[PDB]
Every structure is written in C-alpha cells, then in structure tokens.
C-alpha cells in the first residue's frame, strides 16, 4: 500500500488487494426536448463528448501545465449483435485502426479530478473507457482510486451526468462485483432467484433443435428485451457461439463473471441469467440512495405468471417464424 502510494505502482504484479472502485454505466433512455443541433446518432455524439471530456481532464505535470493542440480522442467503434461477431469480422485485409494475443477492450489514463485547487492535496483517479459500443449494449466507465476525496469525484460524476443529460442517455452506477455475490457481501441486500414458469428447452409448444443450435437462450434474451433490460456483460460466453483469437482482457483486469449480467434501462434493478435458465433479480441500492418498487414486482409477476410469460414466448416464436 505504501509502495504504490509512493509512486512505485509499476511493479506489474497482480496484487491480492484492490483499492476503492466504482463502475458507471451509460444507458440510452430518452431524448431531451429541442437540442436538435435523429435519436440514434445524437447518442454517438454524446459518447464522443463524454470521451472528449474524460481525455481533456487528464492529469498533467507543471511543465505541460504552463505550456499551451492536444491529440484527438481515441475512436469508439460501433457494431450490431454480439461482440464476438465483430471480433470475427475483424479478419478483413484493410486498415489497421480497428480494435488494435490479448485484446485490450479499454484503455487507462490518470485524471485531474480537482482542477480549481479546492483541495490542498493532489487529486488523481484512474478511468477506463471501452473502445466498443452498441445501442443494445451498455457502456462501461470505471473509476479506481486509493486516497482521493470522495466529494470531488462525486461532483465530477455529476458533471459527467449533466453532460450526458444535455444529449440523451442516462449515466448510472452499479456494484463492481457480480450480482450473484451480493448475499456473500451484503446479507441485508434484497436478492431473489427466479425460476421462470415455462422452461423453453422442454416445452412442447416451444422447442426446436435448430433454434437452440443458433440461440440456446433466445427466449430468455427476448424476455429480458421485452421487459426493458440492457446487456451488461458484452464480452461473455453464454450468448454468442463463435471462436476467438485468444482470450480478451480488459484494461483493469480479467473479467471474472460467472453469468451474463443485465441492467434495467431505468437504472434501478439488475438482472442476471444463469446457465440452467434461472434468473437473478435485485435492485440497485446506490441509485435509489442517490436519488419505485412496483416495477421489479411486476417483472417478477411476468416471470412467474404462466399467461404473460406464455404471451411473451409466443411473440418470440412468432418473430422467429416470420
């Protein structure tokens, strides 16, 4: 702790202890009135402005502080469908500025959280922002700090949220650890496991070997989509079915996620889909405390009522047929 606090953090050894961490999730929710300056390309500009503000908030030495054009922001790249489809699509023999044997999905830099000299110390967090983004996949912004004041980072997050809300989107925060581990950390936390009423792998009304060869969890993903959820784990191995050019590693560490995670577009509840078709369901306490209980109960009712789940699965089968 003293070694990394003295500036000797370049030891490049996976330490068993972690600093203070906070993960922030950008969710496309709603366009504000006016601000015309299409509801599908203005969010691209919003992410561009967020990345530009983050890279513009870079911590710089006094020699570069006294001096006076900075480099352009790194490009965020867009695609549709699973991430592994884009990774496989990268085989084309053209260009070199396209996701470029471990693949770093994010990049890290040190920021200057207190610019006005409010604090007598020096304030410096670490940010990580992804190099990929989809309208159907949530965006990850992370914040790692060890000794910073937990109020200047709060108004920095508020500034980022306001800069988002001028455009569309809605910045939200979720726990860094997996949803399945909250009972093993916070026993008072609300956490319910959902065994859905109709099992699509054995129901006579809903069964096809070709469909499960294409998409095994097609009905569950469509249920989560119709209930208003966004995929959190964009780099998981439970939805896509393709190969890879060795493992993918984030800029902060290896993704140790047991199951795929899903985030409600409101930002209030977190869902998690298991291997055996069971669903996890729990609210986001940080958003509730920073800023509403009938929606999660309604989602539990739709996952437990036979008729409504049957209607959603019938809609899924009708869309699959046509």
């Amino acid at each position: 702790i003293d070694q990394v606090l003295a500036g000797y953090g370049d030891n490049l050894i996976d330490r068993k202890w972690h600093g203070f961490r906070a993960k922030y999730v950008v969710l496309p929710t709603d366009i504000p009135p006016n601000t015309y300056s299409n509801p599908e390309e203005i969010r691209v500009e919003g992410l561009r402005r967020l990345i530009g503000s983050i890279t513009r908030s870079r911590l710089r030495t006094e020699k570069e502080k006294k001096g006076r054009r900075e480099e352009i922001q790194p490009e965020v790249m867009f695609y549709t469908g699973p991430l592994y489809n884009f990774i496989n699509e990268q085989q084309t023999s053209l260009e070199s500025s396209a996701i470029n044997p471990i693949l770093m999905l994010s990049n890290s830099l040190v920021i200057d959280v207190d610019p006005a000299g409010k604090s007598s110390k020096q304030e410096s967090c670490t940010v990580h922002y992804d190099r990929v983004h989809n309208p159907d996949h949530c965006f990850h912004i992370r914040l790692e700090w060890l000794t910073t004041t937990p109020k200047l980072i709060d108004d920095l997050v508020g500034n980022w949220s306001r800069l988002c809300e001028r455009y569309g989107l809605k910045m939200i925060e979720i726990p860094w650890e997996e949803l399945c581990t909250i009972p093993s950390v916070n026993p008072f936390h609300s956490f319910v496991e959902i065994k859905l009423a109709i099992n699509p792998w054995e129901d006579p009304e809903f069964k096809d070997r070709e469909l499960f060869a294409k998409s095994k969890f097609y009905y569950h993903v469509y249920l989560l989509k119709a209930s208003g959820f966004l995929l959190d784990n964009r780099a998981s191995k439970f939805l896509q079915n393709q190969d890879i050019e060795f493992d993918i590693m984030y800029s902060w560490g290896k993704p140790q996620f047991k199951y795929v995670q899903y985030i409600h577009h409101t930002g209030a509840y977190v869902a998690e889909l298991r291997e055996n078709g069971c669903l996890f369901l729990a609210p986001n306490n940080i958003y509730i405390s920073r800023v509403a209980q009938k929606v999660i109960l309604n989602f539990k009712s739709t996952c437990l009522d036979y008729q409504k789940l049957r209607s959603i699965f019938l809609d899924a089968k009708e869309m699959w047929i046509t």
């Binding site: 504000p32 009135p33 006016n34 306001r162 800069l163």
Partner: protein
C-alpha cells in the same frame, strides 16, 4: 436604463411587475415583459435594436417546475444577447422559493449556477458574468434583487455611497436609505450591511407616510417618527421620485437639537444632490 423581463409562461413576471411597480435611468420605468416559450429563435428578426436598448436583461426561473429546459432557453438567449452588445448586465431570478428550506435553496442555486456555467462553456461564451438572486413575492427578496439590478445601472454609485457615509458619520445616523417613492427600491446606502429588519421597518415607514399623506389631500414630504427608546425615523423627499429615509439614534442627547442638526445636514445633502443629475 430599461430592464427587460424574460421568462416562460406562468413563471410570475406579471405578478412581480404588479407587486413591485404597482403595489429613463433611475426611476421605475414601465418595464417590458416578454413571454418566451420553447422554440427555434429566428436569426436577427429586427431584435438587435431592442436588445441594444435594454440596460440590463432579467430572467425569471420558476423553482417549483422543472428548469433544465429553462436554463437551456436562457443560454440560447444569452448566446445572442452577449454577441449583440458586450456591455449588458445579465441577471437571473430564482422565483417561488418561499416553501423551501435553506439547504434546499442553496443546493438549488448551486445546481442552477453550475448548469448555466456548463451550458455557457459549451456555447463558447467567455467573459460573461451572470448574477443569481433567490426571489419571492411574499418577502423582501424581490425588492433587494431589483435594488441590486437598479444599482448596477447607476454609474454614480460610489459618490452616493461616500455622500451617505459622510451624512451618517456627521449626524449620528444608524442607517440611512435613499429610497424611491414607488416600488420601495432603495437606491443607495452606506458601507454598513443592509439589515433586513431595518429595511422592512423603513419600507413600512414609506408605506405609512404615503398612505397618511394620501388620506388628507387637496389643501416636499417630511416625517419624524420617534420611538420609546429615543430612536427616531426621519423622512425627506429628494429630487424627483427619490426619498431619503434614515434611522438616527439620540445617544443620550437632546431630541430637538438632534432634529435641528439632522435637518440642516440633510438639507445640505439635498443641496449637494441638486448638483448631481442622479434624479430621474
């Protein structure tokens, strides 16, 4: 110095105008209301002469309703207001804050200030300073906000401050206000802080004086009101609509001698005020 009142519908501009100005440079002129709804602004629709004729622009934000779009429209207004004339003082009033706590009021003012600053940073405007005031009709806050707005448009402020400071230093005055006959908007004072209680006392003294004069008419306003502890409240009408109200403490002296020296000193001050064209 014609001030322009701008805001969304049902924010309280007409009620503010009625309460203040119904109960040139310095007198309470007929101000201009302007209902600004959300829309796309037409580029230079002969509004340059209008905004060039405005001494200071005043914006009204309703704290009860959502105000992010109001701040966005305000930023759009400032975007051409500062471009047309770079000498316009811009004022923003946070109206309808009577039913809010002090902490909530301060947090709301800080949030509005941060949002306006960030939006002006996005639009690229620099060198512009916008003042913010927490105003409400039911109390003294709107009067003080309009007092600051009017004081920002009188170039002879420091000389009046020096004159009132000398008058108070040589007459044993506790606090002297240079009011105006209508709207109770005090124009100048001393370096002493403007006490809210004393300001309300002087304003109700103005109201009592004007009402009692209006009760007996059809046959230069002067009024001396002495309390039980010897503290007197003096009134003397200045040039045009200006009126001087002072609270003079006796400090264990003769009442009539204090009245005589205060009358002579205030007459000298009025003779000095005759030379400067601060009236109207």
């Amino acid at each position: 110095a014609m001030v322009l009142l701008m805001g969304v519908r049902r924010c309280g501009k007409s009620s503010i105008c009625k309460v203040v100005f119904h109960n040139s440079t310095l007198i309470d002129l007929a101000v201009m209301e302007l209902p600004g709804q959300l829309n796309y602004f037409e580029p230079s629709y002969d509004s340059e002469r209008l905004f060039k004729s405005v001494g200071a622009l005043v914006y009204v934000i309703d704290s009860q309703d959502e105000y992010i779009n109001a701040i966005t429209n305000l930023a759009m207004i400032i975007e051409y207001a500062y471009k047309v004339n770079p000498s316009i003082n811009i004022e923003v009033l946070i109206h309808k804050v009577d039913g809010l706590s002090e902490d909530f009021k301060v947090d709301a003012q800080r949030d509005i200030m941060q949002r306006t600053g960030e939006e002006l940073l996005e639009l690229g405007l620099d060198g512009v300073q916008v003042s913010f005031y927490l105003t409400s009709i039911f109390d003294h806050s709107i009067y003080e906000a309009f007092s600051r707005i009017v004081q920002k448009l009188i170039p002879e402020l420091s000389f009046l401050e020096n004159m009132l400071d000398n008058l108070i230093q040589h007459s044993k005055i506790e606090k002297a206000f240079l009011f105006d006959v209508n709207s109770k908007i005090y124009v100048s004072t001393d370096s002493n802080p403007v006490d809210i209680q004393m300001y309300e006392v002087c304003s109700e003294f103005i109201d009592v004086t004007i009402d009692l004069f209006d009760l007996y008419k059809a046959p230069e306003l002067q009024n001396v009101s002495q309390l039980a502890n010897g503290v007197i409240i003096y009134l003397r009408q200045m040039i045009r609509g200006l009126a001087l109200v002072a609270i003079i403490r006796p400090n264990g002296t003769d009442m009539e001698s204090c009245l005589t020296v205060a009358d002579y000193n205030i007459d000298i001050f009025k003779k000095g005020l005759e030379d400067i064209w601060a009236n109207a």
